[PDB]
Design a protein around this motif. Structure first.
Motif, PDB file in Angstrom:
ATOM      1  N   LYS D  15       0.849  -1.180   0.000  1.00 48.35           N
ATOM      2  CA  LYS D  15       0.000   0.000   0.000  1.00 48.35           C
ATOM      3  C   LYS D  15       0.887   1.233   0.000  1.00 48.35           C
ATOM      4  O   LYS D  15       2.102   1.145  -0.185  1.00 48.35           O
ATOM      5  N   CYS D  16       0.261   2.398   0.160  1.00 48.58           N
ATOM      6  CA  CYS D  16       0.983   3.611   0.514  1.00 48.58           C
ATOM      7  C   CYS D  16       0.034   4.570   1.215  1.00 48.58           C
ATOM      8  O   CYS D  16      -1.189   4.482   1.078  1.00 48.58           O
ATOM      9  N   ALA D  17       0.625   5.507   1.962  1.00 50.70           N
ATOM     10  CA  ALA D  17      -0.173   6.480   2.697  1.00 50.70           C
ATOM     11  C   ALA D  17      -0.797   7.519   1.773  1.00 50.70           C
ATOM     12  O   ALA D  17      -1.756   8.194   2.159  1.00 50.70           O
ATOM     13  N   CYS D  18      -0.274   7.662   0.555  1.00 56.76           N
ATOM     14  CA  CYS D  18      -0.945   8.460  -0.465  1.00 56.76           C
ATOM     15  C   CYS D  18      -2.036   7.680  -1.188  1.00 56.76           C
ATOM     16  O   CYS D  18      -2.653   8.221  -2.114  1.00 56.76           O
ATOM     17  N   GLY D  19      -2.290   6.435  -0.787  1.00 55.34           N
ATOM     18  CA  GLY D  19      -3.347   5.631  -1.355  1.00 55.34           C
ATOM     19  C   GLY D  19      -2.953   4.799  -2.551  1.00 55.34           C
ATOM     20  O   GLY D  19      -3.748   3.953  -2.980  1.00 55.34           O
ATOM     21  N   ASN D  20      -1.759   5.005  -3.101  1.00 51.30           N
ATOM     22  CA  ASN D  20      -1.334   4.227  -4.255  1.00 51.30           C
ATOM     23  C   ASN D  20      -0.957   2.814  -3.835  1.00 51.30           C
ATOM     24  O   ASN D  20      -0.159   2.605  -2.917  1.00 51.30           O
ATOM     25  N   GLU D  21      -1.553   1.838  -4.511  1.00 51.89           N
ATOM     26  CA  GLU D  21      -1.324   0.437  -4.219  1.00 51.89           C
ATOM     27  C   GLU D  21      -0.499  -0.176  -5.340  1.00 51.89           C
ATOM     28  O   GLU D  21      -0.511   0.294  -6.479  1.00 51.89           O
TER      29      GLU D  21
END
Lengths: 108, 78, 176, 63
Positions: D15-21
């Motif tokens: 995942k990422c905290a910017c929402g990019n998976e």
RNA sequence: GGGCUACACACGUGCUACAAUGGACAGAACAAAGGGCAGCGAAACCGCGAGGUUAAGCCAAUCCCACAAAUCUGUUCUCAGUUCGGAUCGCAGUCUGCAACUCGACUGCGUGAAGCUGGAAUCGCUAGUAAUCGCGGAUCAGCAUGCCGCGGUGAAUACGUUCC
């Protein structure tokens, strides 16, 4: 972890944020008011919302490597231009104007 | 020196503006060390009196926020 | 999975028409990735080898070899043997997964990250990432980290000259 | 591949905290990330914060 | 204009700490003594703050300096080189004054060091004393950790003259 460096999980937020190079106590209290964590939580106990607000607030602030590289730029600046204050930076003798027959023992 | 302005002596300002109204020249022998560097000084080689000699220093873009006597230590050491 | 498909589909026509090869087989491909460890504290710290025999098994599940010194060195207080450094070789699908970890996940976590060097090509078409902190991609777990001992990654293409390995590794995702 | 030696590999849903998976295959089944490539400001061209911040002092005459 | 503020070193006197009898944050109280005329400066306003602007009162048991501090009471950390300590230092400020570069005090942000009670040796004190906490004044535009006074809390021990 937050600015590319850790904060301790088991401290409160106000003082776990102190261990980031660039945030002391009062910028930490200026952050957590803007974030709204109310200063009484562990950082092992936060939510991703509540810690993401802390992250991007600190991302707005001049914190981690910026501070070291720019303060090295200031020191190298007044070393290179001449500037007796940078001569004190170089030699290991005190900068702010301080007696040297005695202590001056942070610098040599 | 807070909000009253920066500081320079009037005589050194006079000499530098005579130097700046046409073009640069030789060094300015100047005993004033107390005076800040305006950005209009840049390029003017000036001779600061250290106590016993006149040291020539050439003023750059960086050497502005400081003063003249930062570029002449007065005490020789080893 | 995704970096093979990205590489083939987007890169191989684009790189083939960027360097105008007279055949499809002349297109450079990343053949292998060799991860050196190079832990030489085995002399003064006899256990330490297990550190990164533990870790590099977690970095890529292909177990590294406990590699041995091939010559006795008196200046390093070391006879021939007493093994020094671990070593992973890598080719297949886990390796494009590993560059997916490096490019997209790990290399942000370099805590002073800027343009990693243009000047790390040998003159033949091969590249090395020099790592100084062993926690970059999130598996490493600060909890299980005391010694920060970093790593050497050897990204090995099949490129014959050097700047076409440059234009390979920029398109894979290495920033410079 | 040697048996009993290598650890397992499942499909990592990074995942990422910017929402990019993003998808890989690792030891961890699922990975949360705080800063990915597209989140890190160096990958995003000339970044906002440090590049907007890094103007050196214009001989601070202003006052 | 510089130096008396140099600095590899030693060395007297002092200040601050190394910490839970502690640190930080909030509430409540209790003093003495002294200074003020081109000086003391209320209150209001603004500034995070150092302070700033307009100005009352005061040649003073009236008015101001002057919102005492340790203390007590709640909250908080939990024994770590830390929520100890503040050196050093960068940046931004403030006041004084022709002028704070060598060479001022103070504030604001940040960095955070040596230090976890000190070898040989050694000093002070017999009671409102020692220990500790602030306040004041000379000097003086500004500069105090020094000195000179003031109060606040406030002990331990003296068998004795064997020895220095």
């Amino acid at each position: 972890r937050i600015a590319g460096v850790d904060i301790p999980r088991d401290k409160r937020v106000v003082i776990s944020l102190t261990y980031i190079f660039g945030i002391g106590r009062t910028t930490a209290q200026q952050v957590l008011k803007e974030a709204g964590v109310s200063e009484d939580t562990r950082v092992r106990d936060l939510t991703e919302e509540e810690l993401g607000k802390i992250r991007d607030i600190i991302d707005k602030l001049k914190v981690e490597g910026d501070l070291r590289r720019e303060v090295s730029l200031n020191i190298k600046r007044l070393i290179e231009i001449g500037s007796y204050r940078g001569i004190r930076h170089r030699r290991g003798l005190p900068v702010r104007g301080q007696n040297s027959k005695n202590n001056a023992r942070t610098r040599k | 020196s807070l909000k009253k302005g920066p500081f320079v002596d009037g005589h050194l300002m006079t000499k530098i503006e005579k130097l700046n109204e046409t073009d640069k020249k030789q060094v300015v022998k100047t005993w004033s060390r107390r005076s800040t560097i305006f950005p209009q000084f840049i390029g003017h080689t000036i001779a600061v009196y250290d106590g016993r000699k006149h040291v020539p220093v050439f003023i750059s873009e960086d050497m502005v926020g400081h003063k003249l006597g930062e570029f002449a230590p007065t005490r020789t050491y080893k | 999975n995704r970096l093979k498909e990205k590489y083939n589909k987007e890169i191989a026509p684009a790189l083939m028409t960027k360097f105008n090869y007279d055949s499809v087989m002349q297109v450079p491909k990343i053949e292998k990735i060799v991860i050196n460890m190079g832990v030489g504290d085995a002399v003064q710290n006899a256990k330490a080898i297990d550190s990164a025999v533990e870790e590099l098994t977690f970095i890529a599940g292909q177990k590294p070899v406990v590699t041995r010194a091939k010559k006795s060195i008196a200046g390093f207080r070391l006879r021939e043997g007493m093994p020094i450094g671990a070593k992973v070789t890598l080719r297949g699908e886990r390796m494009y997964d590993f560059l997916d970890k490096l490019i997209s996940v790990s290399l942000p976590r370099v805590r002073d990250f800027r343009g990693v060097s243009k000047k790390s090509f040998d003159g033949r078409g091969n590249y090395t990432l020099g790592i100084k902190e062993q926690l970059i991609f999130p598996e490493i777990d600060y909890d299980k980290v005391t010694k920060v001992r970093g790593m050497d990654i050897v990204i090995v293409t099949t490129a014959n000259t050097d700047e076409e390995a440059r234009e390979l590794l920029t398109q894979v995702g290495m920033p410079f | 591949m040697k048996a009993g030696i290598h650890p397992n590999f499942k499909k990592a849903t990074v995942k990422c905290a910017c929402g990019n998976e993003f998808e890989t295959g690792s030891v961890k089944e699922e990975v949360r990330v705080e800063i990915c490539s597209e989140c890190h400001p160096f990958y995003t061209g000339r970044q906002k914060f440090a590049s907007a911040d890094g103007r050196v002092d214009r001989f601070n005459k202003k006052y």
